[PDB]
mmCIF file of C-alpha atoms in Angstrom:
data_model
loop_
_atom_site.group_PDB
_atom_site.id
_atom_site.type_symbol
_atom_site.label_atom_id
_atom_site.label_comp_id
_atom_site.label_asym_id
_atom_site.label_seq_id
_atom_site.Cartn_x
_atom_site.Cartn_y
_atom_site.Cartn_z
ATOM 1 C CA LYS A 1 -71.082 28.880 11.172
ATOM 2 C CA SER A 2 -67.372 28.383 10.444
ATOM 3 C CA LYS A 3 -65.136 29.407 13.320
ATOM 4 C CA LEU A 4 -62.028 29.397 10.754
ATOM 5 C CA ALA A 5 -60.864 32.693 9.031
ATOM 6 C CA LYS A 6 -62.064 33.684 5.962
ATOM 7 C CA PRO A 7 -58.976 32.755 3.645
ATOM 8 C CA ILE A 8 -59.098 29.014 5.172
ATOM 9 C CA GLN A 9 -62.582 28.694 4.570
ATOM 10 C CA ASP A 10 -62.329 29.382 0.755
ATOM 11 C CA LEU A 11 -59.289 27.245 0.978
ATOM 12 C CA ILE A 12 -61.076 24.204 2.180
ATOM 13 C CA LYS A 13 -63.850 24.825 -0.391
ATOM 14 C CA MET A 14 -61.513 24.939 -3.114
ATOM 15 C CA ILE A 15 -59.702 21.877 -2.495
ATOM 16 C CA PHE A 16 -62.915 19.874 -1.831
ATOM 17 C CA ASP A 17 -64.472 21.312 -4.901
ATOM 18 C CA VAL A 18 -66.136 18.224 -6.877
ATOM 19 C CA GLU A 19 -66.401 20.069 -10.162
ATOM 20 C CA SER A 20 -62.629 20.363 -9.963
ATOM 21 C CA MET A 21 -62.191 16.660 -9.515
ATOM 22 C CA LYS A 22 -64.484 15.975 -12.754
ATOM 23 C CA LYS A 23 -62.671 18.468 -14.755
ATOM 24 C CA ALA A 24 -59.437 16.662 -13.762
ATOM 25 C CA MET A 25 -60.548 13.296 -14.836
ATOM 26 C CA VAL A 26 -61.903 14.753 -18.138
ATOM 27 C CA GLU A 27 -58.589 16.432 -18.930
ATOM 28 C CA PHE A 28 -57.004 12.880 -18.459
ATOM 29 C CA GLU A 29 -59.608 11.678 -20.957
ATOM 30 C CA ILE A 30 -61.406 9.359 -18.586
ATOM 31 C CA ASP A 31 -65.124 8.491 -19.287
ATOM 32 C CA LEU A 32 -66.934 9.899 -16.519
ATOM 33 C CA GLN A 33 -70.087 8.151 -17.740
ATOM 34 C CA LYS A 34 -68.810 4.838 -17.202
ATOM 35 C CA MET A 35 -66.074 5.926 -14.647
ATOM 36 C CA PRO A 36 -67.625 8.230 -12.271
ATOM 37 C CA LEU A 37 -65.862 9.647 -9.139
ATOM 38 C CA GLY A 38 -67.811 7.115 -6.968
ATOM 39 C CA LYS A 39 -66.286 4.184 -8.746
ATOM 40 C CA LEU A 40 -62.612 4.886 -8.154
ATOM 41 C CA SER A 41 -60.982 2.568 -5.883
ATOM 42 C CA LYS A 42 -56.927 2.092 -4.633
ATOM 43 C CA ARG A 43 -56.997 -1.418 -5.852
ATOM 44 C CA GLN A 44 -58.275 -0.370 -9.085
ATOM 45 C CA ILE A 45 -55.483 2.149 -9.259
ATOM 46 C CA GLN A 46 -52.851 -0.013 -8.411
ATOM 47 C CA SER A 47 -54.026 -2.699 -10.865
ATOM 48 C CA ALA A 48 -53.578 0.024 -13.457
ATOM 49 C CA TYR A 49 -50.117 0.905 -12.222
ATOM 50 C CA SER A 50 -49.079 -2.999 -12.650
ATOM 51 C CA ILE A 51 -50.411 -3.016 -16.283
ATOM 52 C CA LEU A 52 -48.633 0.054 -16.887
ATOM 53 C CA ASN A 53 -45.702 -1.679 -15.662
ATOM 54 C CA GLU A 54 -45.693 -4.666 -17.641
ATOM 55 C CA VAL A 55 -46.684 -2.771 -20.777
ATOM 56 C CA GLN A 56 -43.400 -0.556 -20.179
ATOM 57 C CA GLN A 57 -41.428 -3.551 -20.123
ATOM 58 C CA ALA A 58 -43.023 -5.417 -23.109
ATOM 59 C CA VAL A 59 -42.340 -2.182 -25.413
ATOM 60 C CA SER A 60 -38.474 -1.951 -24.000
ATOM 61 C CA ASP A 61 -37.823 -5.674 -24.431
ATOM 62 C CA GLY A 62 -39.581 -5.899 -27.694
ATOM 63 C CA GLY A 63 -42.531 -8.007 -26.501
ATOM 64 C CA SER A 64 -45.331 -9.434 -28.922
ATOM 65 C CA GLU A 65 -47.417 -6.851 -30.479
ATOM 66 C CA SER A 66 -50.159 -9.286 -29.375
ATOM 67 C CA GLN A 67 -49.153 -8.681 -25.754
ATOM 68 C CA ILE A 68 -49.139 -4.854 -25.851
ATOM 69 C CA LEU A 69 -52.571 -5.051 -27.575
ATOM 70 C CA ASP A 70 -53.720 -7.412 -24.646
ATOM 71 C CA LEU A 71 -52.517 -5.121 -22.121
ATOM 72 C CA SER A 72 -53.712 -2.118 -23.741
ATOM 73 C CA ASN A 73 -57.400 -3.699 -23.712
ATOM 74 C CA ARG A 74 -57.097 -4.721 -19.895
ATOM 75 C CA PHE A 75 -55.887 -0.809 -19.167
ATOM 76 C CA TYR A 76 -58.520 0.618 -21.242
ATOM 77 C CA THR A 77 -61.251 -1.787 -19.820
ATOM 78 C CA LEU A 78 -60.112 -0.989 -16.111
ATOM 79 C CA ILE A 79 -60.070 2.671 -16.467
ATOM 80 C CA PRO A 80 -62.587 3.548 -19.162
ATOM 81 C CA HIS A 81 -61.456 6.213 -21.551
ATOM 82 C CA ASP A 82 -63.666 8.637 -23.742
ATOM 83 C CA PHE A 83 -61.555 9.512 -26.908
ATOM 84 C CA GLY A 84 -64.455 11.000 -28.606
ATOM 85 C CA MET A 85 -64.679 10.411 -32.575
ATOM 86 C CA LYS A 86 -61.018 8.872 -32.611
ATOM 87 C CA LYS A 87 -59.666 5.621 -32.309
ATOM 88 C CA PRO A 88 -57.778 4.744 -28.861
ATOM 89 C CA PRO A 89 -54.175 4.733 -28.945
ATOM 90 C CA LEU A 90 -52.365 1.607 -27.903
ATOM 91 C CA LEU A 91 -50.069 1.808 -25.082
ATOM 92 C CA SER A 92 -47.228 1.157 -27.397
ATOM 93 C CA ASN A 93 -45.379 4.430 -26.998
ATOM 94 C CA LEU A 94 -43.286 5.236 -23.620
ATOM 95 C CA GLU A 95 -44.345 8.858 -23.526
ATOM 96 C CA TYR A 96 -47.974 7.822 -23.723
ATOM 97 C CA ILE A 97 -47.240 5.437 -21.042
ATOM 98 C CA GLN A 98 -45.571 7.921 -18.883
ATOM 99 C CA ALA A 99 -48.455 10.123 -19.224
ATOM 100 C CA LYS A 100 -50.759 7.486 -18.016
ATOM 101 C CA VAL A 101 -48.499 6.882 -15.026
ATOM 102 C CA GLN A 102 -48.951 10.461 -14.188
ATOM 103 C CA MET A 103 -52.555 10.342 -14.687
ATOM 104 C CA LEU A 104 -52.713 7.341 -12.193
ATOM 105 C CA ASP A 105 -50.517 9.492 -9.498
ATOM 106 C CA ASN A 106 -53.243 12.265 -9.809
ATOM 107 C CA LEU A 107 -56.217 9.807 -9.388
ATOM 108 C CA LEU A 108 -54.649 8.481 -6.493
ATOM 109 C CA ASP A 109 -55.105 11.916 -4.659
ATOM 110 C CA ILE A 110 -58.551 12.562 -6.103
ATOM 111 C CA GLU A 111 -59.717 9.304 -4.541
ATOM 112 C CA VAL A 112 -58.469 10.221 -1.431
ATOM 113 C CA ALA A 113 -60.404 13.864 -1.647
ATOM 114 C CA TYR A 114 -63.618 12.042 -2.534
ATOM 115 C CA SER A 115 -63.506 9.360 0.346
ATOM 116 C CA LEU A 116 -63.017 12.432 2.805
ATOM 117 C CA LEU A 117 -65.899 14.420 1.056
ATOM 118 C CA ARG A 118 -68.183 11.271 1.331
ATOM 119 C CA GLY A 119 -67.029 10.151 4.774
ATOM 120 C CA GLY A 120 -68.360 11.496 8.164
ATOM 121 C CA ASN A 121 -70.172 14.760 7.841
ATOM 122 C CA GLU A 122 -73.179 13.801 9.962
ATOM 123 C CA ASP A 123 -72.413 16.213 12.916
ATOM 124 C CA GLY A 124 -75.087 19.096 13.216
ATOM 125 C CA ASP A 125 -73.119 21.361 15.907
ATOM 126 C CA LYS A 126 -70.312 21.843 13.256
ATOM 127 C CA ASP A 127 -70.359 23.811 10.126
ATOM 128 C CA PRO A 128 -69.755 21.622 6.929
ATOM 129 C CA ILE A 129 -66.446 23.756 6.041
ATOM 130 C CA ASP A 130 -65.244 22.914 9.610
ATOM 131 C CA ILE A 131 -65.909 19.224 9.303
ATOM 132 C CA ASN A 132 -63.923 18.954 6.268
ATOM 133 C CA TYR A 133 -61.074 21.098 7.685
ATOM 134 C CA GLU A 134 -60.917 18.529 10.741
ATOM 135 C CA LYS A 135 -60.843 15.610 7.963
ATOM 136 C CA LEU A 136 -57.552 16.957 7.027
ATOM 137 C CA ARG A 137 -55.716 16.706 10.307
ATOM 138 C CA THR A 138 -53.615 19.681 9.407
ATOM 139 C CA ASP A 139 -53.499 22.858 11.547
ATOM 140 C CA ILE A 140 -53.768 25.731 9.140
ATOM 141 C CA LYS A 141 -52.973 29.234 9.755
ATOM 142 C CA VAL A 142 -52.941 32.551 7.872
ATOM 143 C CA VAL A 143 -49.352 34.335 7.679
ATOM 144 C CA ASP A 144 -49.612 37.898 8.244
ATOM 145 C CA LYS A 145 -48.547 39.794 5.150
ATOM 146 C CA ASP A 146 -46.349 42.386 6.839
ATOM 147 C CA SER A 147 -44.321 39.983 8.810
ATOM 148 C CA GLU A 148 -40.705 38.596 7.908
ATOM 149 C CA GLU A 149 -41.860 35.094 7.015
ATOM 150 C CA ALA A 150 -44.221 36.847 4.458
ATOM 151 C CA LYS A 151 -41.818 39.228 3.113
ATOM 152 C CA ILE A 152 -39.072 36.371 2.860
ATOM 153 C CA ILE A 153 -41.727 33.988 1.169
ATOM 154 C CA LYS A 154 -42.850 36.799 -1.238
ATOM 155 C CA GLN A 155 -39.380 37.647 -2.339
ATOM 156 C CA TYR A 156 -38.771 34.151 -2.972
ATOM 157 C CA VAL A 157 -41.473 33.838 -5.463
ATOM 158 C CA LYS A 158 -40.708 37.112 -7.078
ATOM 159 C CA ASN A 159 -36.999 36.300 -7.640
ATOM 160 C CA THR A 160 -37.290 32.610 -8.732
ATOM 161 C CA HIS A 161 -39.887 33.231 -11.390
ATOM 162 C CA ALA A 162 -37.415 33.092 -14.408
ATOM 163 C CA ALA A 163 -37.105 34.732 -17.640
ATOM 164 C CA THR A 164 -38.500 31.916 -19.847
ATOM 165 C CA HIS A 165 -41.599 31.643 -17.470
ATOM 166 C CA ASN A 166 -42.513 35.440 -18.188
ATOM 167 C CA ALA A 167 -45.396 33.828 -20.392
ATOM 168 C CA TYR A 168 -47.310 34.977 -16.870
ATOM 169 C CA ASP A 169 -46.857 37.026 -13.768
ATOM 170 C CA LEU A 170 -47.403 35.510 -10.467
ATOM 171 C CA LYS A 171 -49.357 37.209 -7.379
ATOM 172 C CA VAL A 172 -49.320 35.550 -4.028
ATOM 173 C CA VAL A 173 -52.853 35.775 -2.810
ATOM 174 C CA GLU A 174 -52.546 34.159 0.421
ATOM 175 C CA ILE A 175 -49.683 32.250 2.672
ATOM 176 C CA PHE A 176 -50.798 29.640 5.007
ATOM 177 C CA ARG A 177 -48.618 28.109 7.578
ATOM 178 C CA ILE A 178 -49.554 24.472 7.777
ATOM 179 C CA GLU A 179 -48.602 21.720 10.211
ATOM 180 C CA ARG A 180 -49.745 17.978 9.558
ATOM 181 C CA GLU A 181 -50.491 15.970 12.486
ATOM 182 C CA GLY A 182 -47.468 14.024 13.412
ATOM 183 C CA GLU A 183 -45.237 15.356 10.559
ATOM 184 C CA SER A 184 -42.947 17.107 12.549
ATOM 185 C CA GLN A 185 -42.470 13.924 14.808
ATOM 186 C CA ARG A 186 -41.430 11.773 11.781
ATOM 187 C CA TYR A 187 -38.847 14.501 10.441
ATOM 188 C CA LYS A 188 -37.172 14.953 13.845
ATOM 189 C CA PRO A 189 -34.430 12.584 12.895
ATOM 190 C CA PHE A 190 -33.549 14.450 9.732
ATOM 191 C CA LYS A 191 -33.057 17.502 11.795
ATOM 192 C CA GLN A 192 -29.547 16.304 12.372
ATOM 193 C CA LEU A 193 -28.684 16.546 8.330
ATOM 194 C CA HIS A 194 -27.060 19.380 6.774
ATOM 195 C CA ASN A 195 -28.006 21.048 3.765
ATOM 196 C CA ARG A 196 -31.967 21.510 4.729
ATOM 197 C CA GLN A 197 -33.459 23.635 2.298
ATOM 198 C CA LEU A 198 -37.237 25.624 1.826
ATOM 199 C CA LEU A 199 -38.270 24.132 -1.488
ATOM 200 C CA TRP A 200 -41.228 24.318 -3.720
ATOM 201 C CA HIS A 201 -43.633 21.512 -4.895
ATOM 202 C CA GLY A 202 -46.299 22.079 -7.199
ATOM 203 C CA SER A 203 -49.440 20.183 -7.558
ATOM 204 C CA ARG A 204 -52.873 20.170 -9.174
ATOM 205 C CA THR A 205 -55.602 21.941 -6.721
ATOM 206 C CA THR A 206 -57.374 18.419 -6.771
ATOM 207 C CA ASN A 207 -54.187 16.750 -4.834
ATOM 208 C CA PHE A 208 -54.279 18.934 -1.846
ATOM 209 C CA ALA A 209 -56.746 17.088 0.291
ATOM 210 C CA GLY A 210 -54.769 13.895 -0.353
ATOM 211 C CA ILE A 211 -51.316 15.900 0.041
ATOM 212 C CA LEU A 212 -52.403 17.525 3.374
ATOM 213 C CA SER A 213 -54.023 14.485 4.703
ATOM 214 C CA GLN A 214 -51.572 11.556 3.713
ATOM 215 C CA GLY A 215 -48.617 14.013 3.073
ATOM 216 C CA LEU A 216 -46.227 14.108 0.036
ATOM 217 C CA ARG A 217 -45.731 10.212 -0.701
ATOM 218 C CA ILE A 218 -43.759 8.009 -3.085
ATOM 219 C CA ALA A 219 -45.468 6.329 -6.050
ATOM 220 C CA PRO A 220 -46.646 2.858 -4.827
ATOM 221 C CA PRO A 221 -44.528 -0.502 -5.399
ATOM 222 C CA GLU A 222 -46.546 -1.136 -8.630
ATOM 223 C CA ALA A 223 -45.605 1.918 -10.221
ATOM 224 C CA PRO A 224 -42.888 1.423 -12.837
ATOM 225 C CA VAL A 225 -39.422 3.006 -11.911
ATOM 226 C CA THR A 226 -39.584 4.320 -15.667
ATOM 227 C CA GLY A 227 -42.486 6.342 -15.008
ATOM 228 C CA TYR A 228 -40.200 9.019 -13.418
ATOM 229 C CA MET A 229 -37.230 10.969 -14.425
ATOM 230 C CA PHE A 230 -35.019 10.200 -11.214
ATOM 231 C CA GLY A 231 -36.940 7.093 -9.869
ATOM 232 C CA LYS A 232 -39.946 7.018 -7.299
ATOM 233 C CA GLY A 233 -39.180 9.912 -4.819
ATOM 234 C CA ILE A 234 -40.848 13.313 -3.798
ATOM 235 C CA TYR A 235 -39.705 15.881 -6.037
ATOM 236 C CA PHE A 236 -38.889 19.626 -5.272
ATOM 237 C CA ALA A 237 -37.619 22.875 -7.275
ATOM 238 C CA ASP A 238 -35.886 25.909 -5.985
ATOM 239 C CA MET A 239 -37.549 28.284 -8.801
ATOM 240 C CA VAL A 240 -41.087 28.862 -8.213
ATOM 241 C CA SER A 241 -41.506 28.915 -12.301
ATOM 242 C CA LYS A 242 -40.516 25.210 -12.537
ATOM 243 C CA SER A 243 -42.981 24.302 -9.611
ATOM 244 C CA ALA A 244 -45.906 26.648 -10.812
ATOM 245 C CA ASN A 245 -45.904 24.654 -14.210
ATOM 246 C CA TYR A 246 -47.169 21.413 -12.558
ATOM 247 C CA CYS A 247 -50.111 23.569 -10.960
ATOM 248 C CA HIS A 248 -52.121 23.208 -14.316
ATOM 249 C CA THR A 249 -53.899 26.692 -14.289
ATOM 250 C CA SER A 250 -54.758 28.510 -17.369
ATOM 251 C CA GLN A 251 -56.406 31.903 -18.180
ATOM 252 C CA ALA A 252 -59.790 30.333 -17.465
ATOM 253 C CA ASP A 253 -58.513 28.965 -14.062
ATOM 254 C CA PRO A 254 -56.066 31.221 -12.793
ATOM 255 C CA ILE A 255 -55.536 30.285 -9.164
ATOM 256 C CA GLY A 256 -53.377 27.637 -8.118
ATOM 257 C CA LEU A 257 -51.780 26.087 -4.914
ATOM 258 C CA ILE A 258 -47.949 25.357 -4.172
ATOM 259 C CA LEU A 259 -46.218 23.995 -1.074
ATOM 260 C CA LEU A 260 -42.720 25.227 0.405
ATOM 261 C CA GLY A 261 -41.364 22.427 2.221
ATOM 262 C CA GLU A 262 -38.507 21.663 4.462
ATOM 263 C CA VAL A 263 -36.420 19.106 2.906
ATOM 264 C CA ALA A 264 -33.353 17.190 4.363
ATOM 265 C CA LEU A 265 -30.922 17.109 1.451
ATOM 266 C CA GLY A 266 -27.821 16.232 3.289
ATOM 267 C CA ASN A 267 -25.237 14.959 0.898
ATOM 268 C CA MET A 268 -26.839 15.352 -2.737
ATOM 269 C CA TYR A 269 -25.815 12.798 -5.520
ATOM 270 C CA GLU A 270 -25.697 15.099 -8.653
ATOM 271 C CA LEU A 271 -26.774 14.251 -12.002
ATOM 272 C CA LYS A 272 -26.817 15.876 -15.403
ATOM 273 C CA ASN A 273 -29.455 13.680 -16.966
ATOM 274 C CA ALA A 274 -32.125 11.369 -15.877
ATOM 275 C CA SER A 275 -31.549 8.177 -14.187
ATOM 276 C CA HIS A 276 -34.075 5.591 -12.868
ATOM 277 C CA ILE A 277 -32.399 5.558 -9.400
ATOM 278 C CA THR A 278 -33.559 2.492 -7.305
ATOM 279 C CA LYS A 279 -30.739 3.031 -4.773
ATOM 280 C CA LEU A 280 -28.977 5.933 -3.346
ATOM 281 C CA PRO A 281 -25.249 5.342 -3.204
ATOM 282 C CA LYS A 282 -23.591 4.983 0.322
ATOM 283 C CA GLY A 283 -23.277 8.430 1.850
ATOM 284 C CA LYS A 284 -25.828 10.202 -0.256
ATOM 285 C CA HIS A 285 -29.203 11.301 1.105
ATOM 286 C CA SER A 286 -30.940 13.053 -2.296
ATOM 287 C CA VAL A 287 -30.548 13.689 -5.619
ATOM 288 C CA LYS A 288 -29.863 16.656 -7.484
ATOM 289 C CA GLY A 289 -30.583 17.212 -11.195
ATOM 290 C CA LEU A 290 -28.325 19.853 -12.357
ATOM 291 C CA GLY A 291 -29.630 22.928 -14.393
ATOM 292 C CA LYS A 292 -28.517 25.861 -16.650
ATOM 293 C CA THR A 293 -30.421 28.175 -14.180
ATOM 294 C CA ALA A 294 -30.730 28.546 -10.433
ATOM 295 C CA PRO A 295 -31.056 31.085 -7.545
ATOM 296 C CA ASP A 296 -27.935 33.024 -7.067
ATOM 297 C CA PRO A 297 -26.336 31.530 -4.538
ATOM 298 C CA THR A 298 -24.889 34.743 -2.890
ATOM 299 C CA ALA A 299 -28.353 35.728 -2.204
ATOM 300 C CA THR A 300 -29.478 32.787 -0.310
ATOM 301 C CA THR A 301 -30.833 33.390 3.267
ATOM 302 C CA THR A 302 -32.040 31.374 6.258
ATOM 303 C CA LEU A 303 -35.376 31.042 7.890
ATOM 304 C CA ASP A 304 -35.436 29.424 11.205
ATOM 305 C CA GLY A 305 -32.311 27.885 10.534
ATOM 306 C CA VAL A 306 -33.384 26.694 6.912
ATOM 307 C CA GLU A 307 -31.806 27.737 3.689
ATOM 308 C CA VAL A 308 -34.077 29.875 1.275
ATOM 309 C CA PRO A 309 -32.528 29.919 -2.179
ATOM 310 C CA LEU A 310 -34.448 33.423 -2.920
ATOM 311 C CA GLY A 311 -31.642 34.631 -5.151
ATOM 312 C CA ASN A 312 -32.371 35.852 -8.718
ATOM 313 C CA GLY A 313 -32.210 33.175 -11.808
ATOM 314 C CA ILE A 314 -28.686 33.436 -12.839
ATOM 315 C CA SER A 315 -27.310 30.695 -15.435
ATOM 316 C CA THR A 316 -24.990 28.050 -13.694
ATOM 317 C CA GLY A 317 -21.539 27.355 -14.667
ATOM 318 C CA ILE A 318 -22.547 23.918 -16.032
ATOM 319 C CA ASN A 319 -24.168 23.810 -19.669
ATOM 320 C CA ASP A 320 -23.547 20.076 -20.554
ATOM 321 C CA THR A 321 -26.780 19.298 -18.637
ATOM 322 C CA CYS A 322 -30.073 18.587 -19.936
ATOM 323 C CA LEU A 323 -32.123 20.079 -17.270
ATOM 324 C CA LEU A 324 -32.959 24.024 -17.661
ATOM 325 C CA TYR A 325 -33.751 23.854 -13.893
ATOM 326 C CA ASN A 326 -32.659 22.344 -10.784
ATOM 327 C CA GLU A 327 -34.574 19.253 -9.433
ATOM 328 C CA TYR A 328 -34.157 17.869 -5.844
ATOM 329 C CA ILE A 329 -35.540 14.339 -5.037
ATOM 330 C CA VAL A 330 -35.689 12.521 -1.576
ATOM 331 C CA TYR A 331 -36.598 8.840 -1.608
ATOM 332 C CA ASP A 332 -37.667 8.936 2.054
ATOM 333 C CA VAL A 333 -40.976 10.239 2.883
ATOM 334 C CA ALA A 334 -39.765 11.185 6.187
ATOM 335 C CA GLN A 335 -37.131 13.587 4.496
ATOM 336 C CA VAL A 336 -39.733 16.404 4.407
ATOM 337 C CA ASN A 337 -41.712 18.825 6.826
ATOM 338 C CA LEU A 338 -44.127 20.947 4.787
ATOM 339 C CA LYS A 339 -44.404 24.385 6.107
ATOM 340 C CA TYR A 340 -46.409 26.747 3.878
ATOM 341 C CA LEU A 341 -49.187 26.559 1.355
ATOM 342 C CA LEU A 342 -49.381 29.499 -0.962
ATOM 343 C CA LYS A 343 -52.553 30.512 -2.959
ATOM 344 C CA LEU A 344 -51.087 32.017 -6.243
ATOM 345 C CA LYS A 345 -52.897 33.887 -9.196
ATOM 346 C CA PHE A 346 -51.311 33.370 -12.475
ATOM 347 C CA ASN A 347 -51.785 36.386 -14.904
ATOM 348 C CA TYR A 348 -51.152 35.507 -18.633
#
């Protein structure tokens, strides 16, 4: 049997669930008959990114309709889609292209999960749960519900759950302390920075084997800079509500996973509207898209010398901004150190 605590076992079973991986692909409208989980490859995904990059540019610079049709055919041939009884939409609309770029971001992590799942499971002295855990190369521990870490984290969830997101309640089922192999080491240089905060990062449960094994990462080179609001960076939030949305849960699937990461913000380049940032101005370490709501800064606390914006949602002075919520973006994979993993239950 498994030597791991029950909560960690259920966590492993959940992130490595094959049916969840298929459900995700079905939702992205992929044809599972022509494109099964086993056909997915990194190279395929990178080629798909490049095609989306070229089509994005053709739409913007007014390229021949023939070029756009051509690129759409090549995209749909590389990644078979099932539109049912309807005609396949052309990649001639910027929003649909972004939606496709996001799909590929998710497929990248699904590919990692499946490859791990079909990898080295031959050992007999170990339980299957234990073998897959080890594949994650991440030390996972259960945080005591009565401790201060927990209280502080639970307060953070409760208070940053806005008023417009009261379309659901949030219950913290379990909090795990995570530590990815060698992540503390690559993050060390950034402990020298100021404005280090404990921020939220939400994702589909199907992305976690990849997130836990490869850590949060930046879109590959091929991905268009336009497929993302503030360029190719790692995105975080200070309201659980905003992150809780990228979880993709519902009444039929209420359990979600969410990450609390330490991010070395340093000097923030404050923006009120989207910008396809390629480079950061000298002296700046991150980007902060301004929002109309944010936690009350008077209530901010610290946890192991890290700022925790656990304050109640209170409108910010600014109003000429487009974001409802704050958005933090770092462009260096070494500026974040994942700390906790929460298992959340949405009550609609």
